[PDB]
Design a protein around this motif. Structure first.
Motif, PDB file in Angstrom:
ATOM      1  N   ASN A   7       0.870  -1.202   0.000  1.00 11.32           N
ATOM      2  CA  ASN A   7       0.000   0.000   0.000  1.00 11.32           C
ATOM      3  C   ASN A   7       0.900   1.243   0.000  1.00 11.32           C
ATOM      4  OD1 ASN A   7      -2.508  -1.466   0.011  1.00 11.32           O
ATOM      5  ND2 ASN A   7      -2.498  -1.559   2.237  1.00 11.32           N
ATOM      6  N   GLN A   8       1.874   1.319   0.912  1.00 13.21           N
ATOM      7  CA  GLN A   8       2.843   2.446   0.960  1.00 13.21           C
ATOM      8  C   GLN A   8       3.542   2.594  -0.404  1.00 13.21           C
ATOM      9  OE1 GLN A   8       3.124   4.884   3.368  1.00 13.21           O
ATOM     10  NE2 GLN A   8       3.816   5.513   1.346  1.00 13.21           N
ATOM     11  N   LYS A  10       2.310   1.588  -3.543  1.00 11.90           N
ATOM     12  CA  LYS A  10       1.256   2.111  -4.458  1.00 11.90           C
ATOM     13  C   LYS A  10       1.198   3.636  -4.338  1.00 11.90           C
ATOM     14  CE  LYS A  10      -3.605   1.384  -5.757  1.00 11.90           C
ATOM     15  NZ  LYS A  10      -3.788   0.376  -6.827  1.00 11.90           N
ATOM     16  N   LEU A  11       1.166   4.139  -3.116  1.00 10.46           N
ATOM     17  CA  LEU A  11       1.063   5.599  -2.887  1.00 10.46           C
ATOM     18  C   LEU A  11       2.306   6.284  -3.452  1.00 10.46           C
ATOM     19  CD1 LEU A  11      -0.725   7.791  -1.686  1.00 10.46           C
ATOM     20  CD2 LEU A  11       0.430   7.467   0.489  1.00 10.46           C
ATOM     21  N   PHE A  14       2.638   6.299  -7.088  1.00  8.29           N
ATOM     22  CA  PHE A  14       1.631   7.228  -7.648  1.00  8.29           C
ATOM     23  C   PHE A  14       2.263   8.615  -7.668  1.00  8.29           C
ATOM     24  CE2 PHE A  14      -2.027  10.169  -6.930  1.00  8.29           C
ATOM     25  CZ  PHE A  14      -2.430  10.232  -8.242  1.00  8.29           C
ATOM     26  N   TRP A  15       2.928   8.973  -6.579  1.00  8.92           N
ATOM     27  CA  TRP A  15       3.637  10.275  -6.448  1.00  8.92           C
ATOM     28  C   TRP A  15       4.635  10.499  -7.590  1.00  8.92           C
ATOM     29  CZ3 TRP A  15       3.929  14.768  -3.769  1.00  8.92           C
ATOM     30  CH2 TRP A  15       5.085  15.520  -3.986  1.00  8.92           C
ATOM     31  N   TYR A  17       4.539   8.947 -10.564  1.00  8.50           N
ATOM     32  CA  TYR A  17       3.678   9.095 -11.772  1.00  8.50           C
ATOM     33  C   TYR A  17       3.187  10.555 -11.885  1.00  8.50           C
ATOM     34  CZ  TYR A  17      -0.574   8.473 -14.671  1.00  8.50           C
ATOM     35  OH  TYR A  17      -1.564   8.573 -15.613  1.00  8.50           O
ATOM     36  N   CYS A  18       2.862  11.211 -10.766  1.00 12.32           N
ATOM     37  CA  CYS A  18       2.359  12.603 -10.768  1.00 12.32           C
ATOM     38  C   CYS A  18       3.531  13.537 -11.091  1.00 12.32           C
ATOM     39  CB  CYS A  18       1.680  12.971  -9.448  1.00 12.32           C
ATOM     40  SG  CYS A  18       0.182  12.004  -9.092  1.00 12.32           S
ATOM     41  N   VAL A  19       4.701  13.308 -10.479  1.00  7.21           N
ATOM     42  CA  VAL A  19       5.951  14.077 -10.787  1.00  7.21           C
ATOM     43  C   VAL A  19       6.226  13.963 -12.294  1.00  7.21           C
ATOM     44  CG1 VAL A  19       8.452  14.164 -10.479  1.00  7.21           C
ATOM     45  CG2 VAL A  19       7.006  13.858  -8.488  1.00  7.21           C
ATOM     46  N   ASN A  21       4.163  13.267 -14.686  1.00  5.31           N
ATOM     47  CA  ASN A  21       3.088  13.808 -15.559  1.00  5.31           C
ATOM     48  C   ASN A  21       2.573  15.159 -15.047  1.00  5.31           C
ATOM     49  OD1 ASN A  21       2.810  11.568 -17.553  1.00  5.31           O
ATOM     50  ND2 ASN A  21       2.476  10.373 -15.719  1.00  5.31           N
ATOM     51  N   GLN A  22       3.321  15.878 -14.199  1.00  8.64           N
ATOM     52  CA  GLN A  22       2.823  17.100 -13.511  1.00  8.64           C
ATOM     53  C   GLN A  22       2.340  18.106 -14.561  1.00  8.64           C
ATOM     54  OE1 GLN A  22       5.341  19.147 -10.532  1.00  8.64           O
ATOM     55  NE2 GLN A  22       4.019  20.920 -10.722  1.00  8.64           N
TER      56      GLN A  22
ATOM     57  N   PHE B  42       0.847  15.986  -2.047  1.00  7.58           N
ATOM     58  CA  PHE B  42       0.080  15.849  -3.301  1.00  7.58           C
ATOM     59  C   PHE B  42      -0.770  17.101  -3.589  1.00  7.58           C
ATOM     60  CE2 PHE B  42       0.522  11.361  -4.609  1.00  7.58           C
ATOM     61  CZ  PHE B  42       1.072  10.784  -3.497  1.00  7.58           C
ATOM     62  N   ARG B  44       0.531  19.727  -4.332  1.00  9.29           N
ATOM     63  CA  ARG B  44       1.389  20.237  -5.435  1.00  9.29           C
ATOM     64  C   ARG B  44       0.719  20.062  -6.805  1.00  9.29           C
ATOM     65  NH1 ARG B  44       7.646  18.526  -5.997  1.00  9.29           N
ATOM     66  NH2 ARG B  44       7.784  18.278  -8.296  1.00  9.29           N
ATOM     67  N   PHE B  45      -0.031  18.971  -6.997  1.00 10.96           N
ATOM     68  CA  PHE B  45      -0.549  18.540  -8.319  1.00 10.96           C
ATOM     69  C   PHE B  45      -2.013  18.928  -8.519  1.00 10.96           C
ATOM     70  CE2 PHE B  45       2.493  15.135  -7.009  1.00 10.96           C
ATOM     71  CZ  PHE B  45       3.518  15.538  -7.834  1.00 10.96           C
ATOM     72  N   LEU B  60      -4.518  12.854 -17.129  1.00  9.38           N
ATOM     73  CA  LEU B  60      -3.650  11.786 -16.602  1.00  9.38           C
ATOM     74  C   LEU B  60      -3.591  11.886 -15.080  1.00  9.38           C
ATOM     75  CD1 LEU B  60      -0.917  11.573 -19.379  1.00  9.38           C
ATOM     76  CD2 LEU B  60      -2.552   9.812 -18.688  1.00  9.38           C
ATOM     77  N   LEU B  61      -3.674  13.090 -14.518  1.00 12.03           N
ATOM     78  CA  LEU B  61      -3.510  13.254 -13.057  1.00 12.03           C
ATOM     79  C   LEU B  61      -4.832  12.887 -12.375  1.00 12.03           C
ATOM     80  CD1 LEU B  61      -1.266  16.489 -13.138  1.00 12.03           C
ATOM     81  CD2 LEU B  61      -0.621  14.110 -12.575  1.00 12.03           C
ATOM     82  N   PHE B  66      -6.854   4.403  -6.841  1.00 14.71           N
ATOM     83  CA  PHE B  66      -7.173   4.478  -5.385  1.00 14.71           C
ATOM     84  C   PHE B  66      -8.684   4.546  -5.156  1.00 14.71           C
ATOM     85  CE2 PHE B  66      -2.895   5.808  -5.931  1.00 14.71           C
ATOM     86  CZ  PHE B  66      -2.263   5.027  -4.989  1.00 14.71           C
ATOM     87  N   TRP B 281      -8.748   6.160   0.961  1.00 20.76           N
ATOM     88  CA  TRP B 281      -7.954   4.934   0.743  1.00 20.76           C
ATOM     89  C   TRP B 281      -7.000   4.750   1.926  1.00 20.76           C
ATOM     90  CZ3 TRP B 281      -2.761   4.037   0.041  1.00 20.76           C
ATOM     91  CH2 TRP B 281      -2.406   2.786  -0.473  1.00 20.76           C
TER      92      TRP B 281
END
Lengths: 373, 373
Positions: A7-8, A10-11, A14-15, A17-19, A21-22, B42, B44-45, B60-61, B66, B281
């Motif tokens: 779970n940690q 996945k989170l 995800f972070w 993935y956001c960096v 695709n920011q 998060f 930030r996004f 995408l974001l 989750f 989540w």
């Protein structure tokens, strides 16, 4: 027990993935250049703007004082005296557009609501929700309402109280329904301005037209009844929020007094986000009139740059007046997918949002486009 | 230009006021013991769950992955197979209760919606919004629907398709409308279970009944059509969110195909909060079945402690079965104001939320109460 490991992971995945695709966004209107760092820490608190911000809540953790100042910033920006204005920070343009259509429906219970073919899909939801009578109107090719077809249909329907849904910045083509034209044409049918409604959907352009030299009709001076703006679209926000601004005279009139139970406030929601009002307050106070104008001149120019570089080549691209939405014919499965372009009928578009400090991401586009020609 | 000084002050003032009043809450249901520190970053996004999480978004974001896992946690917790369930993380219980009532209204367009006098004010808003036919029903003194008056009114109305609004954890008295009783009584009127709707409003108790020994009827095994829970109420959240869970068979059936424009998803909103789904989540994955049960046994016991210490003294206080809402007669202007007690007709109440690790704040109450007697 705190978070497991998978779970940690996945989170934290995800972070990354956001960096990654920011600043991905080139095709949608959501501006990704904000700093609400200073507000990250308020996620510690259970903040709840449940109720009207003008009244008071025994629920002590609320940003009502900041919501008040956002509503006075917009009142003034849309040229209605704050004393004469009511509205709140919503959960999006949709809740803002639902509130306005609600306002019209209550004032003109029999009113047909009129909306062009280039109107946001959100109006379909609204119309079912509010069980309101609806008439679709044709679009001119640039995305504007076929004003002539509006009036034609207002007459056939023999409608005395039309509820006009005005697209102030169409999603696909960036069009602006000229509310001054509309008003005149419906005046010319011998309908008094008091006996019908005009709601501005301004999700995007409500934070464009106010910082432009020659703005179209959109504001309360320009004679609308209610406007909706999306906080997250142009100003930029991590959480989708909206601003809706209406006439107090109208809002107040539609008394929410039901079979025994009395909705104590004129809001559509129960408990409301109290963080987004801070977020909107920061953005609106951390930018001068001149700071936003700069941001939008740069957005407008870049959108001109893109028509230019494309027009020079074969491509018949264009941009409506004050738009930051450059429309051109839709290219290969590669291009649109590999830039996340919203594609809807022989046409793509890019939006020159201001998280582009530079055309680099945009020339990156035009290059992969001229390569088809 | 970044924030001025007077503005930076207002924000920093406000932070201190929130620190001051962080654990103020004793009278409302919003639990203030959460740690979403790990998620502060998060903000930030520009995250946007616009659309259905089961389908895909070119935007995408989004926390769809989750949101999926939260919907599978609740599906299972409310005893419906996830494959057979549809729902999403809303902006609150209200949007969850509006979605359910929307679902019923579309299935039974003519259906009168039935709701007790102890129903949340939010249903008044919903009923006007959805232009739905409504019949108020009497309350038993503990806050439950007068089941007998429901059926009486279902017959007088000659209603074949009642939409039952069931209060699963009344705001004021903590009552629970026994959906199993209701079903039987409406069965006894010779109405088939397929030909009417039951929506559970479970804002609070939807995260109580699942961790209790002998739960009342509330879940999909217990035979409801849709449930609404408030994330921010019991689990605790800095941003108000909701979970709504419905039957796919029902959701799917009500096709949103309007005059040309096609709402591409079964959601009520446009762009949706993508941060709150993470928040939900974390809470749901950072607590075992046993961890929540512990939290609620402690809440339940404390509420017993409070009836006890008050019952010993003169005071006729009580708590419905599985409730954490201790109702007693309303004291002085001092007491209710100086503890922020929700007061509604000769009655106050406290909620033994689990940000009370200790009765200290609660005995603080009972002491200022016994002092009137």
């Amino acid at each position: 027990m705190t978070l497991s490991i998978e779970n940690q992971n996945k989170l934290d995945e995800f972070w990354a993935y956001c960096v990654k695709n920011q600043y991905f966004n080139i095709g949608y209107p959501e501006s990704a250049d904000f700093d609400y760092t200073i507000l990250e820490r308020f996620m510690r608190f259970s903040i709840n703007n449940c109720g009207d911000w003008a009244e008071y809540s025994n629920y002590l953790l609320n940003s009502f004082d900041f919501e008040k100042e956002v509503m006075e910033y917009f009142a003034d920006l849309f040229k209605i005296p704050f004393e004469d204005s009511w509205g709140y920070v919503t959960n999006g343009g949709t809740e803002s557009n639902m509130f306005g259509c609600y306002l019209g429906r209550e004032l003109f219970p029999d009113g047909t609501l009129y909306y062009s073919k280039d109107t946001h899909y959100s109006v379909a939801k609204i119309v079912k929700l509010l069980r309101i009578k609806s008439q679709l109107v044709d679009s001119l090719p640039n995305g504007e309402i076929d004003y002539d077809d509006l009036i034609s249909k207002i007459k056939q329907d023999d409608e005395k109280h039309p509820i006009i849904f005005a697209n102030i910045g169409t999603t696909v083509r960036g069009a602006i329904d000229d509310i001054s034209k509309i008003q005149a044409m419906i005046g010319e049918l011998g309908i008094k301005r008091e006996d019908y409604y005009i709601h501005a959907d301004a999700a995007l352009s409500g934070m464009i037209l106010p910082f432009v030299d020659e703005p179209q009709g959109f504001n309360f001076a320009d004679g609308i009844d209610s406007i909706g703006v999306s906080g997250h679209k142009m100003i930029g926000s991590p959480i989708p929020c909206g601003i809706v601004v209406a006439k107090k005279r109208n809002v107040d009139a539609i008394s929410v007094e039901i079979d025994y139970i009395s909705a104590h406030d004129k809001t559509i929601t129960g408990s409301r986000n109290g963080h987004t009002p801070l977020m909107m307050w920061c953005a609106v106070k951390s930018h001068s009139h001149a700071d936003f104008k700069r941001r939008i001149n740069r957005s407008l120019d870049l959108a001109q740059h893109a028509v230019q570089r494309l027009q020079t080549a074969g491509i018949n691209a264009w941009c409506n007046k004050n738009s930051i939405t450059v429309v051109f014919p839709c290219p290969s499965e590669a291009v649109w997918k590999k830039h996340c372009l919203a594609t809807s009928g022989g046409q793509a578009h890019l939006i020159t949002t201001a998280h582009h400090l530079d055309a680099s991401k945009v020339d990156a586009l035009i290059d992969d486009v001229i390569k088809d020609a």
